[PDB]
Amino acid sequence: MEMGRRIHLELRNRTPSDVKELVLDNSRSNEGKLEGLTDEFEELEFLSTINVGLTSIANLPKLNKLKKLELSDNRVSGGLEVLAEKCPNLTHLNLSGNKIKDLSTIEPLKKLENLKSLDLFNCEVTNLNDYRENVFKLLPQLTYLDGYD
């Protein structure tokens, strides 16, 4: 089923500004981009869009209260600078299973000042000699990476 309709189903007639949690796993993104998420979700704290065929997060809306973002099992490969811009208060980010290939692409996350916890399981960057040391060098504000420390 389609992400927009999924959003409508999940909401069950609550107005978007009342919602603190949204799970869209296994719905279909509009050809790889988020559909139907808008900046009216001003109270949204946890957003899950696992396995929705995402290619890009370029069209994330302003979500000032967003704390935990689940993007597991998609094909996102860049444009992570949007995160610091659109959801600055993020503390938990899951990018597992995505096409995150190197340090250069996760660098824009140093602007996420409150990032506490990051997952990159099964990502290609995970193959790096001293992968854990490099990521902690890069993002000195992080405490947890792939569940550990």
CA Rg value for the chain = 15
Tell me the DSSP string of 28-66.
B-BTTB--S--TT-TT--EEE-TTS-----TTPPP-TT-
- Breaks in the chain, named by the residue before each, with C–N above 2.5 Å? none
Residue found under tokens 């704390």: 67
One-letter amino acid at 34 equals L
CATH of 1-149, one of 3.30.390.10, 3.80.10.10, 3.10.130.10, 3.40.50.2300: 3.80.10.10
Header resolution in angstroms: 2.7
Q: Give the β-pairing of 92-94 and 117-119.
A: parallel
Method of structure determination: X-ray
Tell me the DSSP string of the chain.
-BHHHHHHHHHTT--GGG-SEEE-TT-B-BTTB--S--TT-TT--EEE-TTS-----TTPPP-TT--EEE--SS---S-THHHHHH-TT--EEE-TTS---SHHHHGGGGG-TT--EEE-TT-GGGGSTTHHHHHHHH-TT--EETTB-
